[PDB]
Structures are given as structure tokens and as C-alpha cells.
């Protein structure tokens, strides 16, 4: 059981733009404090995919790390631009949220935002006047995903799904016969230059390395940035120690150490199988959307 789930790779910024009032606990997320945009992701069995890759980036972290661009416009308040993509997707929102965010068909981060002192309804399709104690200060993640930087081009990858006629907002072909319809929890991936790519099967492998996002460092725990640590035969502001993998690359001072650095288990470069070929995605996730299959 991992004690450094809140010790985030990259910057660890979990806030959406224009909701700035829990920055002290969300910018960055770390061991202490509560974050309405992040904490829900760590509750048991609520976000299974992200919990198996918890040392990879959240959607919000990926936005603030410039891995994912913000949609244009970035919010929408509740009728036309949103709610097309939002209405094909079936989601439950806890009470007291003013905002909720998702990866859209273009691979950008979109959000739905309620007016001041309004909250999202349980299905996140409407806003209603504040019932309850207090609006939360963050945004609710509507998808189960994780992200990483990638240069791998996917300008040629398009959703391919056997017998599927429509999945979400994407119509894959013309079906003239009658269709069966269902809300399905569907795996998807997003690549450099690709649109959202829905998949029949999610198939992933991790390749481990010794890059900075493969370690977590800590001084009651406090977060420590590993960029302060000098690599072997190189310069750095602080003194560090760690496991053997760390000491294989950075300088290790068992007596004068400020921080310790362990390997972040599960970290590494993630790859996904797309039509038989292994490709490195920007984000991978699950989404509950309308799917239409031929009969």
C-alpha cells in the first residue's frame, strides 16, 4: 500500500482555470490537506484505471504541464457547444460541485461550469441553486484516466470497433439495419495529432526508467523536488539519498541528506496496442457513453 500517492509527478497542479481558492492544497497537491479536484480519485474502487497508474498525471496536471491543451472555449455554462459531447456521456456527480471537466473529442480539456452559488445535478447535465452547506472550490473529474507527455504521432489512428455504428459523438459508418443501444464503459486513448480513439480492448504495458517522474522524494511527510538533487558528477542545491536505483544516477549522502527518493512504483512510459501496433499515448481512459451496435 503506497504512502506517496499524493506526492505527484510534474508540478502536481490540480485546479481548473478560474477556480483558484484551494490553491494552498491543490497547487500543488501534496501529503497534507484536502483537494476537491484530486481526493475523489483516491477513493477505493471509484477510479480503477487511475488507481493502477496513480503516479501518472491527472487530466488537470496534464493541462498545467502543457501536455493537453484547453478546449476553446474552455468552460461552458448551462447549451449548444457543450451538452452535445456531455449529453452522450452518462456520469454521476457528487453534490456541491460548481464545475466538472473532461477530455473532449479533439483531445482537449473541456468543462461544464454552473453560475455562482449554483451546483451541478447528480447527472451533471443541469445546474441548480445551492442546496447544502458550501460549494466546493474545485472541479470534478468525469472520466477515469491518466496522462503522460509523448511525441509519438497518431495522425493516422482512428476509432475502429467491430459492429459498432456510433460511439459517443463519433459515427463510424452507415448502418441501415436496426441497432441496439446501450451505455457502455468504453476504453479510449488520445495521441499527438489524433482525435479521441475509442477501442474494443485496452491493452497496456509499462517500460520502467530512471527519469525524474519515476521517483518520489520527501524530507508528517513533506514533498521535495528532485530537480534540487545533483546527478552524479554534476551540480545541485540540496543533499539527497534514496534507494539503489536513485543512487545509481544521483549523489547519495547517507548522513547529510535532506530528502530521500524512492522509485515510484508503477511509473514508467506506458504504451497501448492500437490495431496490433504498440503506440505511446498522451492519455488513456474509460468513459461511459452511448454505443450503438448493429443487430
Amino acid at each position, epitope marked *: 500500500e503506497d504512502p506517496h500517492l499524493r506526492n505527484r509527478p510534474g508540478k502536481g497542479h490540480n485546479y481548473i482555470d478560474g477556480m*483558484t*481558492q*484551494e490553491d*494552498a*492544497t491543490c*497547487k*500543488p497537491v501534496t501529503y*497534507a490537506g484536502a483537494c476537491s479536484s484530486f481526493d475523489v480519485l483516491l477513493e477505493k474502487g471509484k477510479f480503477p484505471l487511475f488507481q493502477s497508474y496513480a503516479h501518472h498525471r491527472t487530466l488537470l496536471e496534464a493541462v498545467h504541464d502543457t501536455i493537453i491543451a484547453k478546449a476553446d472555449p474552455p468552460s461552458c455554462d448551462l447549451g449548444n457547444p457543450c451538452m452535445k459531447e456531455k449529453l452522450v456521456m452518462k456520469t454521476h456527480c457528487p453534490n456541491d460541485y460548481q464545475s466538472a471537466h473532461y477530455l473532449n473529442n479533439d483531445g482537449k480539456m473541456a468543462s461544464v461550469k454552473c453560475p*455562482p452559488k449554483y451546483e451541478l445535478t447528480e447527472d451533471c447535465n443541469f445546474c441548480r441553486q445551492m442546496t447544502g452547506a458550501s460549494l466546493k*472550490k474545485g472541479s470534478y473529474p468525469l472520466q477515469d484516466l491518466f496522462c503522460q507527455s509523448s511525441e509519438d504521432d497518431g495522425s493516422k489512428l482512428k476509432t475502429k470497433m467491430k459492429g459498432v455504428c456510433e460511439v459517443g459523438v463519433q459515427a463510424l459508418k452507415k448502418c441501415d439495419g436496426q441497432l441496439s443501444t446501450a451505455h457502455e464503459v468504453v476504453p479510449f486513448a488520445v495521441f499527438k495529432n489524433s482525435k479521441k480513439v475509442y477501442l474494443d480492448k485496452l491493452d497496456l504495458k509499462t517500460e520502467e526508467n530512471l527519469l525524474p517522474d519515476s521517483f518520489v522524494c520527501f524530507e508528517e511527510l513533506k514533498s521535495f523536488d528532485i530537480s534540487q538533487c545533483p546527478k552524479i558528477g554534476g551540480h545541485g542545491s540540496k543533499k539527497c539519498t534514496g534507494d539503489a536505483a536513485f543512487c545509481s544516477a544521483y549523489e547519495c549522502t547517507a548522513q547529510y541528506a535532506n530528502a530521500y527518493c524512492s522509485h515510484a512504483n508503477g511509473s514508467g512510459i506506458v504504451q497501448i496496442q492500437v490495431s496490433g501496433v504498440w503506440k505511446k499515448p498522451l492519455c488513456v481512459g474509460y468513459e461511459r457513453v452511448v454505443v450503438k451496435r448493429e443487430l
Partner: antibody
Amino acid sequence: QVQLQESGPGLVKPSETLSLTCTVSGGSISTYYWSWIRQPPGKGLEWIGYIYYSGSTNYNPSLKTRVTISVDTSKNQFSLKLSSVTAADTAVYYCARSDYGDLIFDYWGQGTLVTVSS
Amino acid sequence: LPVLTQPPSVSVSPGQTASITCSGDKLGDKYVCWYQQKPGQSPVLVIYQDSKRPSGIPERFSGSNSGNTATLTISGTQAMDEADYYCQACDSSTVFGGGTKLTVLG
């Protein structure tokens, strides 16, 4: 249970820099917002800025060019610097704590009077 | 930069109902806090989030906010309640009101 205690000189010459320190007791800097607020004799309240443990800040835009707020978690205090000071800066300076960045001030210090005079 | 306007000087006879107003454009979209200050001491939070009361504050204190106007009301005002009252936009772009001195007559 927290107590906030402002300390600093009571006299600052014009154009010089004003400096204050708030010491938190019976509590910690932790994840709260720590704010400086001032009140000119006989006048209303004005918010100067806040800081939180990471060192990130946010200043009143009327004052941002002359304000520095800094934090010292190891000593459980935080500080205000207000530069090129003027007679308009004569005031009681308060430190205050809030839970979130909406700045609901539920704990206040006692206030220090700083007079600007030659 | 925002400005909230209160009246200086509200007057009320004991046991009656004092009402402090605080105005600004679309103030009803922001959450409002109220503070009471008595001679020589620090402000004390009396109302937060337009209408909530901190633990330990007499229930005769209530508040409301709608349109361009927030209101702090004391029912059955005592001599105890002679003080200055400040409203604040305890929301994104924070600002205080100019303050209201409350004199309780008789």
C-alpha cells in the same frame, strides 16, 4: 486555539521600507491562507495580500508593486515588506488567517500601529 | 478595482431591528462576510457566506444577499451591539466596505 502576534518597528521614515512579522502560536502555518490587513486611524479595512506555506502569494493590485510577503515555516511566522512608504501607509497592520482563498478571516492578530514620520 | 458602499451611521432604539446595507454591482454573485469591530480591538467575523453564523455568535445576527445589495440585520439590538460593521466580498476579488457605525439610542 491559534494566536497571531504582530511585531515590528512602530516608526518608519518616508520612502523607507516597512517591515512586520506575525508569529503564529498554538498552531501552525500548515495549509491556511495568511493575510495582512491594515486600517488607517479612523478609517476602513484594506486587504494587503496573502501567502501560503509554499511561498506563493497574491497581492492587492493597488499595492502589488510595493508589497512583499514571505513565509518561514521552520519558525512558524510570516512577514510583510512595504516599500517607498508614504503618510498614507500610517495604519494599524493586522495579520489574519483564513481556511481558503476566499479570505474568510476568522482569526485575527491584535494589530500593530505603524506611523510614517520623519 | 471594486468598491462596496455602506452608509456611515445607522441608528436604532433598543429591542428594535437594525439593518446594515452594503452595495456593489452584481454583489449578489459574490459571497459576503460581515465583521463587527469594537473600540480598540480587532474585527470579529459575525456572518460568512452571506448568511451563516460562526459557532458562538448570538442568533439575533443574520444576513442576506441578492441583486446589488447585501444586508446585515440584528433583531432586538442591545447596547452590546454598538460597534462598527464591515462587509467584505469574501470571494475572488476581495474588498471591504467603508464601514458603518451603529449607535443604539435611548
